[PDB]
Amino acid sequence: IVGEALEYVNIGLSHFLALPLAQRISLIIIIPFIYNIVWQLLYSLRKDRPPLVFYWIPWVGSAVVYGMKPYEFFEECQKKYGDIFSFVLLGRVMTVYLGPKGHEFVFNAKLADVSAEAAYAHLTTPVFGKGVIYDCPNSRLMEQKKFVKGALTKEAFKSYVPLIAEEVYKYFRDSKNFRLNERTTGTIDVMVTQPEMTIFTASRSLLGKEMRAKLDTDFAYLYSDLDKGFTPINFVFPNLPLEHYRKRDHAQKAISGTYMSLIKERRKNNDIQDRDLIDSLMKNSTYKDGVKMTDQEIANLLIGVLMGGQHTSAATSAWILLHLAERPDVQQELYEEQMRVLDGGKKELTYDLLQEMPLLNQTIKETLRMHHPLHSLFRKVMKDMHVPNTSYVIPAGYHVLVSPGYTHLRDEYFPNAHQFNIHRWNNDSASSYSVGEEVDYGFGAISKGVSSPYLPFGGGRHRCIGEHFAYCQLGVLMSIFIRTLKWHYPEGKTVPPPDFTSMVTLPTGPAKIIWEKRNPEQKIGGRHH
Numbered sequence: 001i002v003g004e005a006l007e008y009v010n011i012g013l014s015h016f017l018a019l020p021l022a023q024r025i026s027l028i029i030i031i032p033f034i035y036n037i038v039w040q041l042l043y044s045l046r047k048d049r050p051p052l053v054f055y056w057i058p059w060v061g062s063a064v065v066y067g068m069k070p071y072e073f074f075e076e077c078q079k080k081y082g083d084i085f086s087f088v089l090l091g092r093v094m095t096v097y098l099g100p101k102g103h104e105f106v107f108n109a110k111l112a113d114v115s116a117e118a119a120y121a122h123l124t125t126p127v128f129g130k131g132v133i134y135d136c137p138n139s140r141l142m143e144q145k146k147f148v149k150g151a152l153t154k155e156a157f158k159s160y161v162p163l164i165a166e167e168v169y170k171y172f173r174d175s176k177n178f179r180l181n182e183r184t185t186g187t188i189d190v191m192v193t194q195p196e197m198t199i200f201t202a203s204r205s206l207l208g209k210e211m212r213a214k215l216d217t218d219f220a221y222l223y224s225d226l227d228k229g230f231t232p233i234n235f236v237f238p239n240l241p242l243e244h245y246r247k248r249d250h251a252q253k254a255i256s257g258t259y260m261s262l263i264k265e266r267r268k269n270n271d272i273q274d275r276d277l278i279d280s281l282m283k284n285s286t287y288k289d290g291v292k293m294t295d296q297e298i299a300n301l302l303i304g305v306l307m308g309g310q311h312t313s314a315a316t317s318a319w320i321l322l323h324l325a326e327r328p329d330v331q332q333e334l335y336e337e338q339m340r341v342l343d344g345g346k347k348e349l350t351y352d353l354l355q356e357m358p359l360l361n362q363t364i365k366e367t368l369r370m371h372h373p374l375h376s377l378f379r380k381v382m383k384d385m386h387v388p389n390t391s392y393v394i395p396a397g398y399h400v401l402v403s404p405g406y407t408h409l410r411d412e413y414f415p416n417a418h419q420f421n422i423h424r425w426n427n428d429s430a431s432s433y434s435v436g437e438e439v440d441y442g443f444g445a446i447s448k449g450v451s452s453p454y455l456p457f458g459g460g461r462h463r464c465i466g467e468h469f470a471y472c473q474l475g476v477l478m479s480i481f482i483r484t485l486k487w488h489y490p491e492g493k494t495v496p497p498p499d500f501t502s503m504v505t506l507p508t509g510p511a512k513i514i515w516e517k518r519n520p521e522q523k524i525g526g527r528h529h
């Protein structure tokens with residue numbers, strides 16, 4: 001009968017629970033291994049799902065290959081499966097949609113369909129603090145971006161340019177990496193100098209002289225502490241009780257405390273001007289429902305703004321230096337533009353004159369094409385998503401992944417994509433531009449279409465608002481580098497490959513260049529010890 005088989009189910013169960021633990025832990029790995037494999041083969045039979053990349057190790061998925069070489073990973077998947085495909089990543093299912101259609105499917109997705117803050121809050125909230133960026137409803141984000149943008153105006157950039165210039169010259173004068181008054185040539189690691197120059201120039205201009213002054217003290221170590229807490233590791237283990245995580249948390253409290261100290265001091269003195277982003281957020285951080293940002297939230301939002309601009313910009317100036325190091329022809333061409341626009345150095349650099357340096361701006365544009373700082377952008381899917389002109393459905397709980405930086409490197413959209421060529425942007429020197437209709441999500445009119453193959457600043461509701469600041473900063477910095485120095489590689493060295501494991505696609509260090517003064521006898525004035 002069949003009842004006697006049912007007895008043997010029970011018997012077999014009892015014999016299973018009595019196996020030697022050698023065989024039993026052997027089975028606790030062999031069962032999920034086999035089940036994973038069986039599940040994938042079953043999955044490939046669904047026609048309402050994008051092809052899923054095969055993987056051996058459950059939960060881990062394609063994490064290794066994706067983690068180390070994501071563009072190579074995407075190209076292989078693209079050849080095998082086309083532009084839409086899925087892969088497992090440390091517990092999650094990522095659906096990749098490559099190319100301009102993918103830009104459109106993700107950046108222009110319905111607010112109800114996808115969530116950025118659901119993807120990122122665990123990465124950023126620990127670092128920035130509560131109440132801001134991804135620790136708040138999207139509508140709050142939209143207004144925060146409006147608040148920050150309102151400090152990032154043309155009139156602010158006119159005032160930031162000499163402050164940024166002052167910092168670059170102070171760095172050339174005082175830093176051990178240069179000391180131009182004492183040395184006429186030297187070797188630097190751009191992954192040491194550019195992060196420093198970046199935080200010095202961004203602090204001075206966006207936070208002001210007090211906050212810049214504090215980076216000359218041991219307080220600077222908190223920034224370094226806070227900086228470590230910004231790592232992909234936060235995606236799997238956002239909070240685990242080790243030391244790294246406590247120095248981070250301490251840094252957040254300590255730095256936000258310093259900003260709040262200055263904010264409350266400015267208000268108690270009625271010392272509220274138009275100097276910096278701090279003045280600006282103090283005068284302009286009331287939401288449309290009338291709720292005012294707290295001083296804590298203002299401080300946290302300052303941290304997020306500085307942190308965002310820090311890693312994107314520092315990686316970008318590093319790459320610019322690295323590409324130009326093997327292109328003395330491009331340095332020469334940029335130097336001639338500087339001499340023409342600044343009347344042989346006699347004109348002081350201003351924001352308006354920066355806008356008349358198309359080749360310098362094209363050099364930034366081309367670096368951002370070859371080295372998009374963020375190789376992958378994510379959203380969590382909130383509701384089932386039908387993929388147009390397919391029968392594909394992306395179910396809620398999945399994640400979508402868009403990669404404009406991958407398209408940046410495709411010969412079909414950029415001929416000879418792997419060649420650094422600033423002249424591919426001749427008569428097209430703008431950081432970005434909308435080829436047509438606009439829309440406003442709450443922080444200004446931006447392009448409605450997100451189909452450009454070039455999208456260094458993303459698009460849609462989550463689009464960057466830092467692009468003009470980053471061009472101002474990079475522009476001032478590279479204008480001074482060009483006028484002051486020539487540089488090249490040590491023998492046999494060339495452009496390093498990207499390190500894709502970090503949060504930005506920074507160069508693999510150490511990435512060293514050799515500088516020499518164009519004018520060995522030129523002195524940088526000012527007092528120093």
Ligand code: HEM
Binds near residue numbers: 306374377456
């Ligand atoms: C070369 C420099 C930069 C590049 C290439 C860059 C790139 C991007 C990209 C691709 C996004 C969209 C992210 C997504 O869709 O998930 C973004 C968003 C954003 N960025 Fe930047 N960024 C840069 C610098 C900056 C700077 C300097 C600031 C501030 C001064 C900044 C602040 C922001 C903010 C507030 C968002 C909005 C995020 C959201 O709404 O979800 N970024 N950036």
Ligand SMILES: O[C@](Cc1ccccc1Cl)(Cn1cncn1)C1(Cl)CC1
Binds near residue numbers: 304376377464503
């Ligand atoms: O978009 C960011 C997050 C981010 C967004 C706004 C402000 C700061 C940060 Cl760090 C990075 N970023 C974007 N612009 C500046 N930083 C990443 Cl790390 C990709 C998810």
